[PDB]
Structures are given as structure tokens and as C-alpha cells.
Amino acid sequence: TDVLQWVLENDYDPRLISAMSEVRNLVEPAIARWAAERATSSDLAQIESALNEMIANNQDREAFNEADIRYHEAVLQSVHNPVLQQLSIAISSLQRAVFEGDEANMPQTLQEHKALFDAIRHQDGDAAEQAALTMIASSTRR
Amino acid sequence: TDVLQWVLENDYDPRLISAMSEVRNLVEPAIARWAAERATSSDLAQIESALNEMIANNQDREAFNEADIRYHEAVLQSVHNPVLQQLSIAISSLQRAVFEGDEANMPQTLQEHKALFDAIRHQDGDAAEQAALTMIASSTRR
Ligand SMILES: [Zn+2]
Ligand SMILES: [Zn+2]
């Protein structure tokens, strides 16, 4: 009764998934590389704080998701590009408004966010790109 | 009396120009490469048609701009990614709603669109990327 159901294959729409994954693999690894190149230690403190909150509050699926949002928001802010920031917010809003436990991959999820933070702190653009790509692939594999 | 004037340096805002150029250099060369990789001959016919209309109607600054829009729209459609298409449309709308003769660089503009079309037809992703980058640099140099 909603047109989205009429134009998208239910549960698994491969073409939309591929379009989304292509856009994410373009934009988010670039964000990660620019964060590694531009984040200051005050930016790092905001990312690390949200990472620690994710680690600590991985039990209730509301305080963790609240801390996951702050992590990506701190990563995005460390790029210091308001246009890119709005674009990535639009991409993430579309992803959550179209796509459908999360505890079953909680250990892998925390490790991926730690690896992205470590690459950003190390100012390693290649490692940050790889961490972002891994996160997108793990998000897609669900 | 409009807040945009209050938060942006008039005529030339270097930080917004750099943010815009970074976003465009990320997204539009990728669009160009994917067009070179994915466009069909029916896609090529739509791009070539708009290119010829630009060439023919380069005199009145309304039929040319009408044909310039159709060129970029045909390039975008040849990528066959609706998410990327909406993102690039949002970027282009922001560019025209924020930024300010065009005959003085008409010859260079037509040559750049011809070079992008040639790269797309040749399915040369590197050449299409370079043509897009050149177009963005020439747009910025104004
Ligand atoms: Zn996350
Ligand atoms: Zn043009």
C-alpha cells in the first residue's frame, strides 16, 4: 500500500543494494581518508569518546545506536566539508529509511570502528579507506 | 538581508569554493568513469544529440544552457544509478543556487564536452575522469 513496496523487491532488492553500495564505497572511504588527513586531536577525542561509549553501552540497542551515530558524526565533522557532510547525511538517512539483531555481529562492529579510529589517528589514509570499505561490506553482507 | 550573504564572503568565498570543488572532483569524475564503463550506444546517442545542440545553439544563452543541462542529464542517466543521480542533481542545484558571460569561454566549453563524450564512447575511464576534472577546473577558474 506504499509505493516503495511496489517498486522494490521485498526483503532483498539487489539493484538498489548495488546502487547504494556503489555510492557508499565512493563517498565514505573518501570521508575516511580526508578525516585521516585533516582530523585534529580534538577531533580524535570526539571520535574516541563515541567509540568508548559504543564499547561500554553495547547492551541496549538504543544507547549503542545513539553512540554509533555520534561516532560517524564526529568522523564526518573531522572532514570539515559542509557540502560533503550534507551529502553523507542524505545517504545515511536514505539507508535507514529504506533498509531493515545487531548483537550477533557486535564484536566485529566494534573492531571495525576501532580500526577506523586507529587509521584516522595514525593519519593513514590507505588504512582509513580500507576500514571504511570493510565496514560497508559488513553492512551489506547482512 | 539574506543570511547566505551574511555567512559567505561576497563574490569569492574561497572555503565554500574549495568544499564544492572537492565534492565535485569526487563525484563527477566517478560518474564520468562509470558512464564510460556502462553507457550503451543508445546512451551515446542521447549525449551526442545534446552535444550537437550545444554546438548549434551556442548563440542564445538559454537554448545553449538548455542543451548543456540535457548533456549532463544524459551522461548521468548512462550511469544507471538513481542514488548517485539524485546526489549529483543535488550538487548541481546547490552550485547554481549559490554561485554566479559564458561566450568568452564558449569554444573551450564545447571542446571539453566533446572530449568527455569521446572518452565515454571510447569506454576510456581514465580519459573520462580527466575530461570531468578539466571541466570542473575550468568551471572553478571563473
Ligand atoms: Zn557504525
Ligand atoms: Zn556543461
Residue numbers in the entry:
A (entry chain A), B (entry chain A): 79 to 178, 183 to 224
The study reports:
DgoR is encoded by the first gene of dgo operon and negatively regulates the whole operon. It metabolizes D-galactonate through the enzymes encoded by D-galactonate operon (dgo) and a modified Entner-Doudoroff pathway, where D-galactonate is degraded into D-glyceraldehyde-3-phosphate and pyruvate, and then enter central metabolism.
Meanwhile, a molecular docking model of the C-terminal domain of E. coli DgoR (EcoDgoR_C) complexed with D-galactonate was established based on the crystal structure of EcoDgoR_C. Moreover, our study shows that some divalent cations (e.g., Zn2+, Mg2+ and Ca2+) are essential for the interaction between DgoR and D-galactonate, but also reveals a unique divalent metal-containing substrate binding pocket, which is the largest one in the GntR superfamily reported so far.
